[PDB]
Each structure stands twice: as C-alpha cells, then as structure tokens.
Design an enzyme around this catalytic site. Structure first.
Site, PDB file in Angstrom:
ATOM      1  N   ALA A 169      17.023 -32.320 -26.287  1.00  0.00           N
ATOM      2  CA  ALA A 169      17.482 -33.758 -26.564  1.00  0.00           C
ATOM      3  C   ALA A 169      19.130 -33.741 -25.729  1.00  0.00           C
ATOM      4  O   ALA A 169      19.687 -32.464 -26.027  1.00  0.00           O
ATOM      5  CB  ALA A 169      17.641 -34.206 -27.920  1.00  0.00           C
ATOM      6  N   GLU A 230       9.101 -23.078 -33.161  1.00  0.00           N
ATOM      7  CA  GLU A 230       8.696 -22.915 -31.871  1.00  0.00           C
ATOM      8  C   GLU A 230       8.524 -21.258 -31.624  1.00  0.00           C
ATOM      9  O   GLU A 230       7.940 -20.900 -30.703  1.00  0.00           O
ATOM     10  CB  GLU A 230       9.564 -23.527 -30.935  1.00  0.00           C
ATOM     11  N   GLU A 279      18.231 -41.743 -17.308  1.00  0.00           N
ATOM     12  CA  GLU A 279      17.073 -40.904 -17.856  1.00  0.00           C
ATOM     13  C   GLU A 279      15.863 -40.629 -17.038  1.00  0.00           C
ATOM     14  O   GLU A 279      15.899 -40.988 -15.831  1.00  0.00           O
ATOM     15  CB  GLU A 279      17.156 -41.688 -19.223  1.00  0.00           C
TER      16      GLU A 279
HETATM   17  C1  LIG Z   1      13.770 -38.519 -23.507  1.00  0.00           C
HETATM   18  C2  LIG Z   1      14.730 -37.788 -23.189  1.00  0.00           C
HETATM   19  C3  LIG Z   1      15.755 -37.781 -22.156  1.00  0.00           C
HETATM   20  C4  LIG Z   1      16.209 -38.710 -21.567  1.00  0.00           C
HETATM   21  O1  LIG Z   1      15.331 -39.427 -20.719  1.00  0.00           O
HETATM   22  O2  LIG Z   1      17.261 -39.230 -21.432  1.00  0.00           O
HETATM   23  C5  LIG Z   1      16.510 -36.227 -22.204  1.00  0.00           C
HETATM   24  C6  LIG Z   1      16.786 -35.910 -20.823  1.00  0.00           C
HETATM   25  C7  LIG Z   1      16.745 -34.388 -20.597  1.00  0.00           C
HETATM   26  C8  LIG Z   1      18.178 -33.972 -21.588  1.00  0.00           C
HETATM   27  C9  LIG Z   1      17.234 -33.906 -19.270  1.00  0.00           C
HETATM   28  C10 LIG Z   1      15.494 -34.059 -21.311  1.00  0.00           C
HETATM   29  C11 LIG Z   1      14.750 -32.723 -20.438  1.00  0.00           C
HETATM   30  C12 LIG Z   1      15.174 -32.067 -19.371  1.00  0.00           C
HETATM   31  C13 LIG Z   1      13.524 -32.226 -21.080  1.00  0.00           C
HETATM   32  C14 LIG Z   1      12.884 -31.218 -20.554  1.00  0.00           C
HETATM   33  C15 LIG Z   1      13.138 -33.097 -22.142  1.00  0.00           C
HETATM   34  C16 LIG Z   1      13.636 -34.010 -22.930  1.00  0.00           C
HETATM   35  C17 LIG Z   1      14.898 -34.402 -22.518  1.00  0.00           C
HETATM   36  N1  LIG Z   1      15.404 -35.387 -23.052  1.00  0.00           N
HETATM   37  C18 LIG Z   1      14.829 -36.318 -24.054  1.00  0.00           C
HETATM   38  C19 LIG Z   1      15.859 -36.644 -25.236  1.00  0.00           C
HETATM   39  O3  LIG Z   1      17.023 -36.461 -25.111  1.00  0.00           O
HETATM   40  N2  LIG Z   1      15.324 -37.130 -26.206  1.00  0.00           N
HETATM   41  C20 LIG Z   1      14.206 -36.957 -26.595  1.00  0.00           C
HETATM   42  O4  LIG Z   1      13.436 -37.406 -27.350  1.00  0.00           O
HETATM   43  N3  LIG Z   1      13.285 -36.072 -25.695  1.00  0.00           N
HETATM   44  C21 LIG Z   1      13.690 -35.828 -24.680  1.00  0.00           C
HETATM   45  N4  LIG Z   1      12.975 -34.605 -24.112  1.00  0.00           N
HETATM   46  C22 LIG Z   1      11.876 -34.283 -24.493  1.00  0.00           C
HETATM   47  C23 LIG Z   1      11.756 -33.412 -25.521  1.00  0.00           C
HETATM   48  O5  LIG Z   1      12.286 -31.998 -25.456  1.00  0.00           O
HETATM   49  C24 LIG Z   1      10.146 -33.019 -26.138  1.00  0.00           C
HETATM   50  O6  LIG Z   1       9.814 -34.475 -26.622  1.00  0.00           O
HETATM   51  C25 LIG Z   1      10.086 -32.175 -27.211  1.00  0.00           C
HETATM   52  O7  LIG Z   1       8.694 -31.963 -27.525  1.00  0.00           O
HETATM   53  C26 LIG Z   1      10.650 -32.370 -28.669  1.00  0.00           C
HETATM   54  O8  LIG Z   1      10.489 -31.405 -29.434  1.00  0.00           O
HETATM   55  P1  LIG Z   1       9.985 -31.454 -30.831  1.00  0.00           P
HETATM   56  O9  LIG Z   1      10.565 -32.666 -31.532  1.00  0.00           O
HETATM   57  O10 LIG Z   1       8.586 -31.595 -30.717  1.00  0.00           O
HETATM   58  O11 LIG Z   1      10.457 -30.160 -31.183  1.00  0.00           O
HETATM   59  K   LIG Z   2       9.358 -28.527 -29.251  1.00  0.00           K
HETATM   60 MN   LIG Z   3       8.883 -29.116 -32.944  1.00  0.00          MN
END
Ligand SMILES: CC1=C(C(=O)O)[C@@H]2CC(C)(C)c3c(C)c(C)cc4c3N2[C@@]12C(=O)NC(=O)N=C2N4C[C@H](O)[C@H](O)[C@H](O)COP(=O)(O)O
Ligand SMILES: [K+]
Ligand SMILES: [Mn+2]
Ligand SMILES: CC1=C(C(=O)O)[C@@H]2CC(C)(C)c3c(C)c(C)cc4c3N2[C@@]12C(=O)NC(=O)N=C2N4C[C@H](O)[C@H](O)[C@H](O)COP(=O)(O)O
Ligand SMILES: [K+]
Ligand SMILES: [K+]
Ligand SMILES: [K+]
Ligand SMILES: [K+]
Ligand SMILES: [K+]
Ligand SMILES: [K+]
Ligand SMILES: [Mn+2]
Lengths: 497, 497
Positions: A169, A230, A279
């Site tokens: 996140a 994980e 984003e």
């Molecule tokens: C939505 C997201 C982002 C954004 O668009 O601002 C932001 C961008 C970045 C940091 C680059 C980014 C990268 C580079 C990658 C690869 C994934 C994400 C994000 N960011 C966001 C975030 O800030 N908040 C979020 O809700 N999910 C995000 N994910 C996706 C999550 O990691 C994913 O949904 C996982 O499955 C969550 O794990 P669990 O809860 O299931 O354990």
């Molecule tokens: K995860």
């Molecule tokens: Mn998880």
C-alpha cells in the site's frame, strides 16, 4: 541466493539479461528519477538503477525503477516478472499466474528464523531519524508528498498473533518520523487495523520492508485469502523457506536480506493528509489530499549500498497493471472454480487499466448446464463482485474457449463482436465500487457503490449446440497445405520475416 | 494520369514507394492469393501484385491484394490510403478523413465524357462470357462461392436519370453469366433498386468497374448524402473531372481507365443463394447462404494486362476497417457538427472492428452549453443512430479534448476510466441495428433493431468547471525542464532512441 529469494540477486539477474541500465550520473529524486522510470514504463525499456541519487547520505539510498514492468522484445515481454519467480524470461503471463496460484493447493512452507542478515548491516534509531532529509522520490509533480513507499511490503500481525499479513500500500513522508498511507477497506492491512482498534490498541506494531525477496513482493500484491500469512504461501511458491530476522524494536519478522526496513507503529487514532498521488488508473487530482493513518518510524536498518525500489505508476505499463489486475484475475479464476462455474482462465487486459478481467469459459461444460448468457452473467457477477478479490474490477468479460484471454486483441475482438451492448450485459448497482477509479470518486453516482458490469461475449449458440462460425483469419480460413505453402515461400517472395 | 486518378498509376506509385511485391511465380486464385493477402493484412506488409494467376487467359487477370491496408512503418502507416487521395505517405488518419469530407462544402466538379479509353482495349460479349471459367478468387475456404467483387464499384442510376450512385458491395460468381451480391437497406444501391421495382422495371441497367480511379473507390466506400452522384464529389476531392466513357451495351458511364468493367443488369425480382462470406467483423458461417439479387453480365471490357483488386477481409487489418469504419466516422463527425454538437474529430478505432466510433468533444464549447453527460449522450445517439451514416456503428464513445481519438490506446484509456458502466451509458433499443454483426444476427434479440449505446467518457467536471486532473504520464506529470533533461540524456544513458 537465487534472484527470486534476494532483491540484490534479482538486480544482478536483470544486469545479466541486458535488462538494466546502471545510471552513474547524478539523478535528482525530486521528479527526475520518476521521469526516467515513467518513460521506461511507457516505452517498455530496461529497468533504471540510479546508483548516484542527489542527497544520498550514510548509504541511503540507490533507487531501482520499474522493477516489474514489461520488456519490449515480444518473446521476453514478461521477463522481469518471470525473474521474480524462478521462471525463464520467455515465460507467458499464464505461466506467471499459474505459478502464483500453485501455493493454493499445497502445504505452506513456513519461514525459518535467522539471528541476523545483510538488512542488519546499518541502522538509524529514534531522534537520529529524519525522513524529510532522506532522498525519497517525488514521483509525480502534483503528488501531495514524497512517496517513499511504492514497492515495499507492509508487515502487520493480527491481535491473536496467528496472521502476519504482507501487502503493498502506498505511503508518503508526513514528518521527521511519520508516514501517511492508504489503509482502505477491504484490504487486509485495514481489516487488521480495525481488529486492533476494536480492542483499544492505539499503536500497532508494524514494519515496512523495501527490496524484499522478489517472490515475497509478488505475494504482497496478491489477494490471497483472509487469515492466510503470505510468508508460508511465498515459501510454497519458492519451494523453500523465506529466512526472516526479528525486528530490533518489536516482535515482527522481516526478510533477513531486505535492502531497507522501517520498524515502528501504525496508529488506530492519529490521521494526517495523504495524497494526492498519480495512481494505477493514470490520474492525479492536484490539491486533493484525504486524511489517512499515521505510521511512526522508530528504527531504520539497511544493507550496505541499499536500493529503494520505486514504481512510477500511472498510464501503461507499470507494476500497477502488470501485478494488481493480473493477480486479482488469478484469484477471481480460482473463486469461480470454487463456486463451480466453468471458468478455465482469467487475465486483466492492459487496455482495461486494471479495471477489466476477461474470463475464459469451458464451453463443453457450459453446454452441459443448459443455461443462457443473461442467467450466467448474473451468477458470475453475484459470486465475484461481493468478494474482496473482485473489489477493484468493474467489468468482467465472459469469452469462449476460442479466445486467448492473455491477448488484449482477441479479448477486444470478442467484446466488440459477441457482446450486444445493454442486451448482453448485467449491471450491478449495489456491490462495493472501487472509489479510486475517476468515474467513481469524480463521477455521476455514489463513489463507493455500483458501477460494475458482466459483459456476456459468448455468442448465443455457444450456450446450446456449439460454435457455428470460423474466424476470417490466416489461421482458420485457409487449409494447412495452403498455410504451409505460403509460410515456406514468404521471405523468398519478398515479405518480411 | 496521377496515381489518385488512375489505378494503373496507383499500382506503379506503390512500386515506387517500396510498398508492393511483384509475385511473378504462378499463384492459385483458389485460396492461395487470398491466403498471402490475408497474411499481408495481419502483418501490415507490402501489397501483393499477383502477375501470374493460374487460369488467367487473354489478359484476364492479374490480382492486387490489400489495396488499402496498413504499412508497418508508423510514420507512413496510412500511406497506401494516402496514395488513393494525392496525399503524402506520411498523411495522418485526420488528413485522409478531412480530404474525403472536403467535397461536402464546395461545388461538385462534374465528370467529362471521352469517346474511348484503356478499358475498351479488349471485350468479351454475350454467349462468349463464362464467369465460372475466369480466375475469380476463393477468398476464404468456407465462402459460398468465388467473390470476384470485393473492391469494385457498382454503377447504378435512378429512374429520372439524374442520380448515378457509385458504391462497394460484395458479389460472388453465381453461374456462367450471373453474380449474386448484397443489396441491403439502407444502402443507396438498394434505395435505387426499390425506385425501379416501384415503377415495374424487372432488370435495371448496371455496371461494375474494377480498378477505378483510387479517389473514386474511396468515395464508393463513403456514405455521402442521399441523391448526390459520387462522380461530382470525386471531381471536387481531386480538383478536376473524372474522365468517363459510355458502356457499349447500356447508357451508363464508367471511368475510361478502369481495369475491367462488367455491363448488364441488376434484377428487381430474381434472387439466388449468396454467401456465406468472411465479412468485415472477422466471421464466416460455413453453409449459411441467404437469398440476394442476381446481376446478369452481358459484356466485359478490359485493359491490356488487366488487374482485379481484391480485399481479403476479416480480422484486423484490411479495407473493411481502414475504409468502412473510418469513412462512416468522417460522415458522423459532419452530421454531429451540422446538428450543432461540439464535436471536433471522429474515428473508428481498429479494436472496435468497425462497430465503434470515438467522438472528440470541444469541452470549452460543451461548458458554454451548460448540459450534463446523461442529456448529451442521449442527444448524440438521437442525432447519429437515426441516420444512414450511423447504421453500421453500435457504440459511440464521447471523449474530451485531451484524448487523441486517432489513437486506439487513448480511446480505450478514456472508456475504461471515464465511463461508469451502465450509469454513464444511454442504450438505444428502437433504432436500426446492423444485422451482419454476430451479436445481432446470431444473438439474443432482434437481428435488425437495437443493440446500440452512447458511452459518456467525459468526467462530470468536464461539463461544468473543467478538467481538474493531470495525467500520470511523462507528458503531463513532469515539468518541461525535467522532460528536456531526460530526452537529452536518454541515449547517452543507454536507453533505446
Ligand atoms: C490501489 C493502490 C495504489 C494506488 O493506485 O495508489 C498503490 C500504488 C502502488 C503503491 C504503486 C501499488 C503497487 C505498486 C502494487 C503492486 C499494488 C498496490 C499498490 N498500491 C495500492 C494501495 O496503496 N492500496 C491498495 O489498496 N492496494 C494497492 N496495491 C494492491 C495491493 O497490494 C493488493 O490489493 C494486495 O492484494 C493487498 O494485499 P492483501 O490486503 O490482500 O494482503
Ligand atoms: K497480499
Ligand atoms: Mn493478505
Ligand atoms: C458490409 C459489406 C461487406 C461485408 O462485410 O461483407 C462487403 C465487404 C467488401 C466487399 C470487402 C467491402 C469493402 C472492401 C468496402 C470498402 C466497403 C463495403 C464492403 N462490403 C459491404 C457490402 O457488401 N455491402 C454493404 O452494404 N456495404 C459494404 N461496404 C460498405 C459500403 O461500400 C459503404 O457503406 C458505402 O457508403 C455504400 O455507398 P452508398 O450506398 O452510401 O452510396
Ligand atoms: K548492485
Ligand atoms: K484476532
Ligand atoms: K453475447
Ligand atoms: K503494372
Ligand atoms: K458511396
Ligand atoms: K462519464
Ligand atoms: Mn451514395
């Protein structure tokens, strides 16, 4: 240690693939690093390693951009992702997703504890920490702060101690010792935050690890089930334990060979302005910050010659499209199979900007159900759109098994020619909506509810007697003999290879 | 005569451009010529000229495949289309559409009559005609016959003699002296056929001219207004008259330098089985013939060393997507502007398979209208979907003036992130629908009605206060000083040009 188990080994693997540029000239973390990384992502070029970041002090830090973006060579397009997972650089997107799903149906391989590792080579503690003085990147000109956290793993544990969640996140520097970051429903970091809030814990033990084992950052981006740690899933993908070291200032565990670890707390009470941020859908809204939770940093530990990974996310193609939609697609496939739906494959076409998933239907199995597209589309949406793995996805496209779901062109051809607009769609007004999509938060209806659709792109006869057309293409409209005579004479006649 | 006024000059222009392969080896018009042509279209290669067609006799005929398909060099992508129109091979899609629309605001230049021309060099008359003995191509293995007619111009005149229509419609060899081919509502060849039927004429004078002046074949593919003779519109595009010669056996006129002309009649009563055919959406339905009007051929006149042009249409990218969709989009743009809508540009994205048109909105003018997406989407659909120019188009996508509608990727980005599925769409159940699209004829609702949508891919603020976001891309998220530094460093650092 192999590339999938060490971020440092991974960087050397990209250097050996001819997939990395060592930039030894000085680069400003104020926009310039992100601008180079953005142009790499927009042109599918080599990953940039910034070895000379302006303002880098005390070994903090080098920056790697575009850690999981695409290569331009068609045969090795997913090579940077394959090097995360011990796959050959020629691995298909299906090979990657099948590998990430492989730990779904084998025992977890539990992490092993080591007393130290390279992540313990250096440290900064308490009052000596100034996050504002570190070379955290300004990733987009209109961001509300320096987004230090775009490709690290947040580590947080449930109050019963049984569930350690690893997730990505975003977070930006908020102050000398604080970050502000998205902690949104229904993500596991927020589910765990709310469990601590409910029992009255003000400051939750937390760590953020940058430059984790590449298999671990892939699992961090995957929506594996509620209550599954994980760490064991990662072990099962890698076929061996991740080695963890205890944090110095709390009871959490981080990968022993991480580049950089922040240890501290996530508040259940303290909030600070967060964003805006460029984003995953390709937009920033200048000036539009929203209160987000405060992380307090109490210790930093890091490797010698530490590297901070950076995702300069936005328009195609970066980690947000190569990891977020594709790994949601993998989990949606498995949920559909769980529910007994005839889905064999799923992918998030890049053109959908991580809001679309294409579901490949086993049409033999479908015909045995004697259903229709209207009933089938409603059932698929009812299963997927009320589950966390479907939260970020606003359009499911159902296609028959003549369509390669991994090929954007095939999916768009099926969509445009097999799905009668309105007639063949089922709209979902009442399910949770992903508010980050501009047509949600900046649109005409409720920002957090509805705006989803299942698009039936199977022709009517696929549900009943079977496929009754032939593609008007080289592959399907000409006999084998004719195809071979053409392909054998192609270059001799004067056409290109 | 220049390339845009003579097919033979046009073929030599492609040869001069390095855009043509002379195939001097024997090629079978039974599937082999079309198979080569189809692979050219799927790979954007050089146009094939079959100089040695198996079964050719007495100068009938050579074949030119892919006469208006795409080039692989991105700076000359539209160069084969540009050479139809006296434009440079670097012409944009916008330049081509602007040129085709240029004649709608200036007086027609009427054709001039000549007593003879190259098309009169050779003739076959009456009982000597055996169409089953000519090397008509088999274009797809599952077609219902040999589609001689994929890139020729039907010439047919109204009963009062004042309106002469030029159009492209497919026809296949039906017999020794007959073709069968599509004559469908609302097309002008059908409107004129019905005018003759209403006064009791059984056989309407007709000609079909192959290898016409390239400007003429472009106008033949374009839905110019009802009752406007294409000859004068073509004259206006070219800025000089088309030279016409009278047919020997009727009172119709054909371009004097046509490669091949068939003279005869179109029936108002008699039908014959026609199709199936690998058609513009990429589908053939094996065994699925339908009745179509009978054309009778009474005379063939042709040039020495005559060339038959051939479109091996189907999946991307051939003449049915480079000409049908794009020229409809051009006429739709003009219709929108005549209705007073703030539309600056329109294109038919190749990913929509000639069923989508993206409409670029002048948002400064839109805000001066004080409207909203719901009202505006309905108005656009009411204007376009009740007119012949909108007949083949099922999805209109409205986008703001930051989107390049000529770039499929920008259109898909806007559609995916700015159009809330359902909420931001207006569906049209009562308008004419294009039955040839498989989700129409082979779908879940009426083949000839409905199945249309306008998608409002303008964000809510575009209608009121104006664009309040910045794209998260290299062009928009970094200052010019940063962009210039990165562009100037790019190659020195080791990235690709
Ligand atoms: C939505 C997201 C982002 C954004 O668009 O601002 C932001 C961008 C970045 C940091 C680059 C980014 C990268 C580079 C990658 C690869 C994934 C994400 C994000 N960011 C966001 C975030 O800030 N908040 C979020 O809700 N999910 C995000 N994910 C996706 C999550 O990691 C994913 O949904 C996982 O499955 C969550 O794990 P669990 O809860 O299931 O354990
Ligand atoms: K995860
Ligand atoms: Mn998880
Ligand atoms: C729909 C069509 C085709 C098909 O898909 O089978 C078939 C394929 C071929 C021959 C390759 C083809 C090519 C290569 C091109 C470039 C255009 C067409 C076609 N064919 C069709 C056809 O058989 N019937 C039809 O109604 N319109 C067709 N047009 C489009 C018309 O020419 C266009 O709509 C004109 O505007 C009509 O002129 P006016 O009536 O306005 O004067
Ligand atoms: K290194
Ligand atoms: K608990
Ligand atoms: K359908
Ligand atoms: K020639
Ligand atoms: K026409
Ligand atoms: K909208
Ligand atoms: Mn006409």
């Amino acid at each position: 240690e192999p590339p999938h188990l060490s971020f440092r080994s991974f960087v050397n693997a990209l250097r050996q693939d001819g997939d990395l540029v060592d930039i030894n000239e000085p680069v400003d973390p104020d926009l310039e690093a992100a601008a180079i990384t953005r142009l790499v992502c927009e042109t599918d070029d080599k990953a940039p390693l910034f070895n000379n970041v302006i303002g880098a002090k005390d070994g903090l830090w080098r920056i790697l951009g575009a850690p999981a973006s695409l290569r331009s060579s068609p045969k090795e397009r997913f090579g940077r992702l394959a090097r995360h997972l011990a796959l050959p650089p020629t691995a298909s997107a299906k090979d990657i997703l099948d590998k990430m799903l492989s730990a779904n149906s084998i025992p977890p391989i539990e992490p092993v504890i080591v007393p130290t590792g390279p992540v313990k080579e250096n440290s900064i503690e308490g009052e000596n920490i100034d996050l504002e003085a570190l070379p955290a990147p300004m990733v987009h000109q209109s961001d509300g702060g320096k987004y230090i956290q775009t490709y690290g793993m947040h580590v947080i544990q449930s109050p019963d101690g049984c569930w350690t969640n690893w997730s990505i996140a975003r977070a930006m520097v908020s102050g000398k010792r604080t970050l502000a970051g998205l902690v949104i429903s229904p993500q596991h970091i927020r589910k765990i935050q709310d469990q601590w809030r409910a029992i009255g814990q003000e400051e939750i033990p937390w760590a953020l690890a940058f430059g984790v084992p590449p298999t671990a950052i892939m699992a961090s981006s995957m929506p594996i089930p509620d209550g599954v740690s994980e760490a064991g899933y990662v072990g099962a993908i890698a076929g061996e334990p991740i080695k963890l070291v205890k944090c110095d200032t709390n009871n959490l565990y981080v990968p022993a060979n991480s580049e950089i670890v922040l240890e501290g707390t996530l508040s259940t009470t303290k909030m600070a302005p967060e964003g805006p941020f460029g984003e995953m859908h390709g937009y920033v809204y200048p000036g539009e910050s929203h209160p987000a939770p405060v992380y307090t940093v109490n210790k930093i530990t890091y490797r010698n010659n530490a590297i901070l990974p950076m995702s300069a996310c936005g328009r195609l193609t970066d980690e947000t499209q190569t990891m977020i939609g594709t790994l949601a697609a993998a989990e949606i496939r498995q949920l559909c199979q769980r529910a007994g739906l005839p889905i064999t494959d799923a992918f998030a076409p890049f053109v959908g900007q991580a809001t679309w998933v294409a579901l490949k239907v086993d049409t033999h199995r479908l015909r045995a159900m004697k259903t229709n597209g209207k009933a089938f589309a409603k059932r698929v949406g009812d299963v997927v759109f009320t589950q966390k793995v479907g939260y970020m996805i606003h359009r499911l496209i159902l296609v028959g098994d003549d369509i390669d779901v991994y090929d954007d062109k095939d999916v768009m051809w099926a969509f445009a020619t097999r799905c009668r607009p309105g007639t063949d769609e089922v709209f979902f007004d009442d399910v949770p909506g992903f508010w980050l999509i501009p047509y949600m938060s900046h649109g005409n209806a409720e920002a957090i509810k509805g705006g989803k659709v299942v698009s039936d792109a199977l022709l009517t006869a696929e549900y009943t007697t079977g496929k009754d057309w032939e593609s008007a293409d080289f592959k399907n409209s000409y006999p084998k003999s004719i195809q071979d005579k053409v392909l054998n004479s192609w270059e001799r006649l004067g056409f290109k290879k």
